[PDB]
Coordinates of C-alpha atoms in Angstrom, one line a residue:
X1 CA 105.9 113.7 97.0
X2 CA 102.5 113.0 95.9
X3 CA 101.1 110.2 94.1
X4 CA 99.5 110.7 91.0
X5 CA 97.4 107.9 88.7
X6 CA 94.9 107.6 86.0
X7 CA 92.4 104.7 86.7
X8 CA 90.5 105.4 82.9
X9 CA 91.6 107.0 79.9
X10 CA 89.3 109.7 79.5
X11 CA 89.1 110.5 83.5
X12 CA 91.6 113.4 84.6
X13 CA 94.5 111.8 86.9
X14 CA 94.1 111.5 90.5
X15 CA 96.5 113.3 92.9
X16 CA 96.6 112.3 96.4
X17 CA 98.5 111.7 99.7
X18 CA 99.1 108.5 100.9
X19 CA 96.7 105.7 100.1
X20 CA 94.4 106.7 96.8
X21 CA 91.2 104.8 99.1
X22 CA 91.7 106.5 102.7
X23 CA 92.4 109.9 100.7
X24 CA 89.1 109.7 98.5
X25 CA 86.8 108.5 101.9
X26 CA 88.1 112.0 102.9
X27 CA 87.0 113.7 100.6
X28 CA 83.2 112.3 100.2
X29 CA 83.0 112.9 103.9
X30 CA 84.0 116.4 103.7
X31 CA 81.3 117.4 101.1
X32 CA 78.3 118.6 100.8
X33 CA 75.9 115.5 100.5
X34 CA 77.5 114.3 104.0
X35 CA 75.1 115.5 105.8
X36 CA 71.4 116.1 106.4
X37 CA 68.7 114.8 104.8
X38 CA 71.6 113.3 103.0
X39 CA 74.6 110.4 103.6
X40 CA 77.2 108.5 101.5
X41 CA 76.6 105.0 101.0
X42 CA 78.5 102.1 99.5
X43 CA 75.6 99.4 98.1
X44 CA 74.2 97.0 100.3
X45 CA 77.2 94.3 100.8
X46 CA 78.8 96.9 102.5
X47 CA 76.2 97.9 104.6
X48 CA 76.0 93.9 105.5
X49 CA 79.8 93.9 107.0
X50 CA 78.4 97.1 108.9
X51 CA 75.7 95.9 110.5
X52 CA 77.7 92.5 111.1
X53 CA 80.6 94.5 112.9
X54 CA 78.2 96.1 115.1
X55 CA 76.4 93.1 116.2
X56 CA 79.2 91.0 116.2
X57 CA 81.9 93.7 118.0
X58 CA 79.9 96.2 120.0
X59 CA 82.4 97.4 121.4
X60 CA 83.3 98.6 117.9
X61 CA 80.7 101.5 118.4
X62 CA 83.6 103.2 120.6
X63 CA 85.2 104.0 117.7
X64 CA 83.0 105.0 115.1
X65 CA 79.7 107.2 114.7
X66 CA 76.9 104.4 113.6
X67 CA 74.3 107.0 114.2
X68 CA 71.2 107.4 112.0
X69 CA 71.9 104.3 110.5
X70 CA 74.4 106.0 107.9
X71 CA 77.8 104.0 106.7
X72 CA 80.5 105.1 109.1
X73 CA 83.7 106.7 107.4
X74 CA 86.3 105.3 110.5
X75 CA 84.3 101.9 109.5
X76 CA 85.1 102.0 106.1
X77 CA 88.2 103.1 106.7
X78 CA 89.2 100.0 108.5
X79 CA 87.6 97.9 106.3
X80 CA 89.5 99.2 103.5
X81 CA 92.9 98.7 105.3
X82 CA 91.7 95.3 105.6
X83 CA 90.8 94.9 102.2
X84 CA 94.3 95.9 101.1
X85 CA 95.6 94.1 103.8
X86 CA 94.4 90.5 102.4
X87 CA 97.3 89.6 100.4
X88 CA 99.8 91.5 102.7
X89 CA 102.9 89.2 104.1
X90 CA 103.7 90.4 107.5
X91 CA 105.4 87.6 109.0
X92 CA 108.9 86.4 107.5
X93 CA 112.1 88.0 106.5
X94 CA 112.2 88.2 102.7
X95 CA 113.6 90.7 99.8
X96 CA 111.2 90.4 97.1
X97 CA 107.0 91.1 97.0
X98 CA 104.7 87.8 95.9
X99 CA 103.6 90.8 93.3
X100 CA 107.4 90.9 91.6
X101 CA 107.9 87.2 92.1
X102 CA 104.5 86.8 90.2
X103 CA 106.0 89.4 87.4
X104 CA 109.0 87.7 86.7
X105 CA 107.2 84.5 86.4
X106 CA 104.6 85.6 83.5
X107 CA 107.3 87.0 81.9
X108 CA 109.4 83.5 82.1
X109 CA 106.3 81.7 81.6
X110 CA 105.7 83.9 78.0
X111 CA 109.3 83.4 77.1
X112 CA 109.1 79.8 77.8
X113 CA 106.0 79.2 75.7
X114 CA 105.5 81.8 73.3
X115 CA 108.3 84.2 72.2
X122 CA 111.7 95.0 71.5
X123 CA 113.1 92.5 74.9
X124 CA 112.5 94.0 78.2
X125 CA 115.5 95.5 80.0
X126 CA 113.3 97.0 83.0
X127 CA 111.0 95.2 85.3
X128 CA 108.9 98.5 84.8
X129 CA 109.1 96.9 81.1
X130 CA 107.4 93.9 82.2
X131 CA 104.9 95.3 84.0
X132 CA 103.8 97.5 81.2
X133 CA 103.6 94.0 79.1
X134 CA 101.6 92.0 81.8
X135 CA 98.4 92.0 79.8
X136 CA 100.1 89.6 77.4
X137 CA 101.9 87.7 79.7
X138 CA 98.5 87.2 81.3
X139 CA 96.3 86.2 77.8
X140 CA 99.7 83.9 77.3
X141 CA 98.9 82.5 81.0
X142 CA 95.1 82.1 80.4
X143 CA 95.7 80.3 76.8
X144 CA 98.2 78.0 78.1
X145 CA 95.8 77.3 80.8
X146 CA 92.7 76.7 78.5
X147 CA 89.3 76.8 79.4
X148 CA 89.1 72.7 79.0
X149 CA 89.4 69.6 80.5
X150 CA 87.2 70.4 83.3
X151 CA 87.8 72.1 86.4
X152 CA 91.2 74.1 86.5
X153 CA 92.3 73.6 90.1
X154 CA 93.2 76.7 91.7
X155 CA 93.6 75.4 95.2
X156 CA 95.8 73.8 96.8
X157 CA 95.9 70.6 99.0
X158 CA 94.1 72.2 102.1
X159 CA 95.0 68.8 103.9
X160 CA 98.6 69.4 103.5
X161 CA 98.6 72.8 104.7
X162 CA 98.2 74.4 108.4
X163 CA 94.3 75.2 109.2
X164 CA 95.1 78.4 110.8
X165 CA 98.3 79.8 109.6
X166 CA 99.1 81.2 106.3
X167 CA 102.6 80.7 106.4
X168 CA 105.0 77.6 106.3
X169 CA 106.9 77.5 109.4
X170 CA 110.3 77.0 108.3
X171 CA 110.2 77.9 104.4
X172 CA 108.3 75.0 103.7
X173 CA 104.7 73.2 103.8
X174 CA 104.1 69.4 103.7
X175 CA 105.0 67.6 100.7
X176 CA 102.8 68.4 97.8
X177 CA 100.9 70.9 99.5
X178 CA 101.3 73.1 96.9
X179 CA 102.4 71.2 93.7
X180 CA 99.0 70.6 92.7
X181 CA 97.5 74.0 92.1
X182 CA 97.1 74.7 88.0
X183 CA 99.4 77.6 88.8
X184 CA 102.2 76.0 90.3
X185 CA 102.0 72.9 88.1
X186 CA 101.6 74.9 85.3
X187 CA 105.1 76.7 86.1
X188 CA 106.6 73.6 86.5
X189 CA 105.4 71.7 83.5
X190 CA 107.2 75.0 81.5
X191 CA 110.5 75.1 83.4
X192 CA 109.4 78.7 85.1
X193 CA 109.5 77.0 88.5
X194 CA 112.3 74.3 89.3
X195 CA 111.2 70.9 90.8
X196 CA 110.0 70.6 94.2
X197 CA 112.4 69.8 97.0
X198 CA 112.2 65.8 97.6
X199 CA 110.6 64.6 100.5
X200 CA 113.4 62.0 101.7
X201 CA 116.2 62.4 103.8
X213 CA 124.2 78.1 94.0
X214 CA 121.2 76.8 92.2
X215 CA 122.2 77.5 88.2
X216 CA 119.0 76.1 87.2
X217 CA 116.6 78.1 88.7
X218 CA 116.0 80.9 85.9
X219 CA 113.3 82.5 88.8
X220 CA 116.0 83.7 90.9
X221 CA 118.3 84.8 87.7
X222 CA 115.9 86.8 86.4
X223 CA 115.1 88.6 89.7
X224 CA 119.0 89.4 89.7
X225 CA 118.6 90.5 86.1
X226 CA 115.6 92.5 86.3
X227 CA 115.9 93.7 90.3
X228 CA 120.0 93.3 90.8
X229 CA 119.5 93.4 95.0
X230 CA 122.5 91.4 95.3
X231 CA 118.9 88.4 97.1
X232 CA 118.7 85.2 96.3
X233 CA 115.2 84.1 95.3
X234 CA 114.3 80.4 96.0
X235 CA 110.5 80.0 95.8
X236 CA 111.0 76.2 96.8
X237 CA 112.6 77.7 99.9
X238 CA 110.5 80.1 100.7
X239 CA 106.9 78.3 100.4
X240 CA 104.6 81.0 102.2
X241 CA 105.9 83.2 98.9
X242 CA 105.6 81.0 96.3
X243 CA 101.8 80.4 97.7
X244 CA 101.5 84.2 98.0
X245 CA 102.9 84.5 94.3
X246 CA 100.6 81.5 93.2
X247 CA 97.8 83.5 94.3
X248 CA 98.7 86.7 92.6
X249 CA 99.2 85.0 89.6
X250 CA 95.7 83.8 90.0
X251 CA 94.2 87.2 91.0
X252 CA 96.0 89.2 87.9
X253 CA 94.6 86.4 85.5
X254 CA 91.0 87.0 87.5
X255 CA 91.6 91.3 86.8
X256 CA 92.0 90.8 83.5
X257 CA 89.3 88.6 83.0
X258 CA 86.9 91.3 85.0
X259 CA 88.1 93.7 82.4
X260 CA 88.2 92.1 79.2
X261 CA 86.6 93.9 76.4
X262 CA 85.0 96.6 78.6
X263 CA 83.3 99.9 77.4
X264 CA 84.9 102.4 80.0
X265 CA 83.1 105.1 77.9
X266 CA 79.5 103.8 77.7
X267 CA 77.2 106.6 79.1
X268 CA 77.8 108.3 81.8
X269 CA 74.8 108.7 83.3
X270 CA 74.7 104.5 83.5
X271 CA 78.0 104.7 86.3
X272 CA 77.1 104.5 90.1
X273 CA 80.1 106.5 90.2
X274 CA 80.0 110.0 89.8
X275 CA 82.7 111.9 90.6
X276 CA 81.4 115.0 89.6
X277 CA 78.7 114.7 92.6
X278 CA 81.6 113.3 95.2
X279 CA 84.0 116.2 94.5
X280 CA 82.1 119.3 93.1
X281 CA 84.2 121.2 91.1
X282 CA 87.5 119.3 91.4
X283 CA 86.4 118.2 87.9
X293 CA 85.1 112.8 71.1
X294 CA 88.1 112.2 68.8
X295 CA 91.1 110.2 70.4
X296 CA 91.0 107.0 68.2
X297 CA 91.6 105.3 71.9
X298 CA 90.5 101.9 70.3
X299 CA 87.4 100.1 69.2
X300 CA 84.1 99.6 72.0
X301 CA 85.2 96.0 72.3
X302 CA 88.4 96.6 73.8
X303 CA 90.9 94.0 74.3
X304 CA 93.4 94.5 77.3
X305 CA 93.2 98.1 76.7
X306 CA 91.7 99.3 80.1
X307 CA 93.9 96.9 81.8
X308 CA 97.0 98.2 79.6
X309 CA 96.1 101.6 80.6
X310 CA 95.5 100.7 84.3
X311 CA 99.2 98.8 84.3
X312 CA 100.5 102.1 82.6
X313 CA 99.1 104.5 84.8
X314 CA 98.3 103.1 87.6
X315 CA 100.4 99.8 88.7
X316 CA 103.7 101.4 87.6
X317 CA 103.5 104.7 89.3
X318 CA 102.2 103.3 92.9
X319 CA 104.8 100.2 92.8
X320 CA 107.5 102.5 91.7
X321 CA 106.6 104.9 94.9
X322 CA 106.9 101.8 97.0
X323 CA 108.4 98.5 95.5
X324 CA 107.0 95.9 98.7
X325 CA 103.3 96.9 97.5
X326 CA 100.9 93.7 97.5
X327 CA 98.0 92.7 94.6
X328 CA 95.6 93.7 97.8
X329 CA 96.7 96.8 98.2
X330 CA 97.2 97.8 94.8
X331 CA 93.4 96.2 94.0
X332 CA 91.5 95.9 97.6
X333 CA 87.9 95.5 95.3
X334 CA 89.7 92.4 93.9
X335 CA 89.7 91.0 97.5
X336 CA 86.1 91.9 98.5
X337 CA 84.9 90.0 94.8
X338 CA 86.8 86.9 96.0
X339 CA 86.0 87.0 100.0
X340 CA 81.8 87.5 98.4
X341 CA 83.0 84.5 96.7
X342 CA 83.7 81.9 99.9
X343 CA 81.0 80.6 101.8
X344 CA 83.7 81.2 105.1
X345 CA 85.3 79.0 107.9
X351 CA 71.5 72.8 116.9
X352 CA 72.6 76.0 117.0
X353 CA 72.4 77.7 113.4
X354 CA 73.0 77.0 110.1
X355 CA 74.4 81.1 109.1
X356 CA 74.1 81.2 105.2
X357 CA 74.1 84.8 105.6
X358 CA 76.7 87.3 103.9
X359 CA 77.4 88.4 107.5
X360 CA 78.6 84.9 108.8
X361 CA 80.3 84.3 105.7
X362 CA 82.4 87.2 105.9
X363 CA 83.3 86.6 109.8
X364 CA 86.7 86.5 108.8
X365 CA 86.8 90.3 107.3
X366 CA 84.0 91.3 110.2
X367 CA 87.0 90.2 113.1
X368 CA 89.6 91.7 111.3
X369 CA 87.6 95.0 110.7
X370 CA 86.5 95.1 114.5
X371 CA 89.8 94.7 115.5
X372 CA 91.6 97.5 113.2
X373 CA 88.7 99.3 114.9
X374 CA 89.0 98.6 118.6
X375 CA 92.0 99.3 118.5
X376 CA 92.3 102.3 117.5
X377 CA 91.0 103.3 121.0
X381 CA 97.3 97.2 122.4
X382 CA 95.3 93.5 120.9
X383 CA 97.9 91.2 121.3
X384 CA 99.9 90.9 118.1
X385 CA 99.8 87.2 118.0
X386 CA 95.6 87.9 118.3
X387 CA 96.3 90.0 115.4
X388 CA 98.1 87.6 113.6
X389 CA 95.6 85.1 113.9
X390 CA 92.4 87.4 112.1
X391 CA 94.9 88.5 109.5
X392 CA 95.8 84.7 108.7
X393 CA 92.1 83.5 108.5
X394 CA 91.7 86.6 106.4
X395 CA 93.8 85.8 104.1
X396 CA 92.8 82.3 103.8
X397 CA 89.4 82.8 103.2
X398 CA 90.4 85.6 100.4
X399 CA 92.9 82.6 99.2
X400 CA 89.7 80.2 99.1
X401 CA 87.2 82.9 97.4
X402 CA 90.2 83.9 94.9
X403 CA 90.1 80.2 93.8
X404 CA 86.5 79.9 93.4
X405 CA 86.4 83.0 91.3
X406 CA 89.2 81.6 89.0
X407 CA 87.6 78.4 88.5
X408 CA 84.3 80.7 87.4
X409 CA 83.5 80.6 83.4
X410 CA 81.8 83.7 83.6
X411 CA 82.7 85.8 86.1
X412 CA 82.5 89.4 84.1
X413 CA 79.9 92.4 84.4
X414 CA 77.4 91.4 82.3
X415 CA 76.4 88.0 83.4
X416 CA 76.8 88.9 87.2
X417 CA 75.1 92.5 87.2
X418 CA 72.7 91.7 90.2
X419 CA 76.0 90.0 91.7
X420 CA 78.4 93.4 91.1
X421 CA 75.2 95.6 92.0
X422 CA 75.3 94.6 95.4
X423 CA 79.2 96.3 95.4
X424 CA 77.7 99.4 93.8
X425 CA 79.1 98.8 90.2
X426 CA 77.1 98.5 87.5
X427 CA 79.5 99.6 84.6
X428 CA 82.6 98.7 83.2
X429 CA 83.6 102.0 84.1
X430 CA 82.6 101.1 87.8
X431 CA 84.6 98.2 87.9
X432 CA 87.9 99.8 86.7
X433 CA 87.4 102.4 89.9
X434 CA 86.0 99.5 92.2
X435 CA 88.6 97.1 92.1
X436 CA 91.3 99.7 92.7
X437 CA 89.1 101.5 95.5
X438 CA 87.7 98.5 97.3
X439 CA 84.3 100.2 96.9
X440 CA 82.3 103.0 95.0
X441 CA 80.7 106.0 96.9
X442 CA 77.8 107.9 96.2
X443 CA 75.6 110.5 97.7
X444 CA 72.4 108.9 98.9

């Protein structure tokens, strides 16, 4: 059983293994310009979390071949795993992903405000464009400041998730997200703060749309309703990255080429107008989200979109001496994480482990927010900004953010 997508609607479908990322590395490292008076490189904020691993995690050159100054494949490799790893819940016995939780409540938020009714939660997926331009109007892009963070003083410094089910009071409540939810009936009330559930339509429609026999309490489960919070954010965030793009401008203006990567392994459809609406991400939801959650149902927003988490960590600023502005200090979080996915591939103590992945996924939380808040956060007026990720086109990004990064033969 291979997996099978189509990332653009005029690209051929991709068929691989495993993990569409890993799988492609292979493949650029197995050709032609490899080697010699040529390498593969990645852009230059890659080549940054390189050169930050080394210095910071010698003993990451163990593990990987940093000779000639060319962009390690095991590197990339681990940093990719950590990429998709961002969003990932590891700790915590649970029966339902932050992504499906985040599903079900676009879909209650859209029935609550706005409305052929979907039976399937493959149907909602395939309708999570409009649940998302329903999300983002409801929003609005007034007022000042959309808050999409939540009260850092009321949550642990360096855990991610709520000890037993819940964080400090009002930790969460805050967030547009959440209170957003709330204000619409998606979301019940909070749980009081002084010394089954019929009304919580969350849980009913997981045992409509699911039916695994689970009950799904957000309020009772905190470190998922943050988690589900966040995807929320990050979907509204893809959409926003993708909104009227031109996935068929000319080729020759796309740092990718997959012609070049893959030599020989590669009009008149009235696909829709140049400035597309929700189209690409329609497509990408179609062909792309469906088929790899179907294949495994736990799958995470990271994993499915590990460019998404590199855009947001770029964002953060991270956790007499010196002052480090640098990308490689702010990025120590993925730099630890990366060096120790690498080291240890030559047994890190889980709890060790546990901790990098946590402050990961913090500073991924923190970036994600400052992205959201962004007014303009698409191609155009960030081209240096996307540039320095090796995209350049809309056509880029659509591969980017499902890739974690965009290869060519240098």
């Amino acid at each position: 059983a291979e997996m099978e997508v189509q990332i653009v609607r005029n690209d051929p479908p991709l068929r691989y293994d495993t993990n569409l990322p890993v799988d492609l590395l292979h493949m650029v490292y197995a050709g032609r310009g490899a080697t010699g008076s040529s390498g593969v490189v990645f852009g230059t904020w890659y080549r940054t979390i390189q050169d930050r691993t080394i210095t910071d995690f010698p003993l990451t050159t163990r593990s990987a071949d940093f000779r000639d100054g060319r962009m390690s494949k095991t590197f990339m490799t681990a940093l990719v795993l950590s990429l998709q790893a961002c969003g990932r819940l590891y700790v915590g016995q649970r029966h339902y992903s932050a992504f499906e939780c985040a599903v079900l409540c676009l879909y209650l938020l859209y029935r609550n405000t706005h409305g052929r009714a979907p039976v399937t939660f493959g149907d909602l997926l395939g309708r999570l464009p409009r649940y998302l331009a329903c999300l983002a109007a409801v929003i609005g892009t007034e007022g000042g400041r959309p808050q999409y963070r939540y009260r850092d003083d009321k949550l642990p410094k360096t855990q991610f998730a709520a000890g037993g089910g819940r964080y400090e009071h009002g930790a969460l409540a805050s967030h547009i997200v959440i209170a957003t939810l709330m204000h619409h009936g998606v979301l019940p009330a909070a749980p009081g703060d002084v010394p089954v559930a019929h009304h919580d339509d969350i849980n009913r429609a997981a045992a409509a749309f699911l039916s695994r026999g689970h009950n799904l309490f957000l309020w009772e489960d905190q470190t998922l309703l943050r988690a589900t919070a966040n995807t929320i954010t990050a979907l509204g965030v893809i959409q926003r990255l993708l909104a009227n793009g031109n996935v068929y401008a000319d080729r020759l203006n796309n740092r990718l080429q997959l012609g070049m990567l893959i030599p020989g392994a590669v009009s008149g459809s009235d696909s829709g107008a140049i400035k597309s609406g929700d189209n690409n991400l329609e497509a990408l939801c179609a062909n792309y989200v469906l088929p790899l959650y179907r294949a495994d149902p736990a799958v995470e927003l990271t994993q499915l979109f590990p460019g998404l988490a590199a855009l947001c960590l770029d964002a953060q600023a991270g956790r007499r001496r010196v002052v480090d502005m640098s990308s490689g200090a702010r990025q120590a979080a993925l730099v630890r994480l990366t060096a120790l996915e690498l080291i240890n591939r030559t047994p890190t103590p889980v709890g060790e482990v546990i901790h990098a992945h946590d402050a990961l996924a913090i500073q991924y939380e923190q970036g994600l927010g400052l992205l959201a808040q962004q007014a303009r956060i698409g191609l155009g007026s960030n081209t240096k900004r996307f540039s320095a990720f090796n995209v350049s086109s809309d056509y880029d990004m659509l591969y980017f953010l499902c890739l974690g990064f965009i290869p060519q033969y240098l």
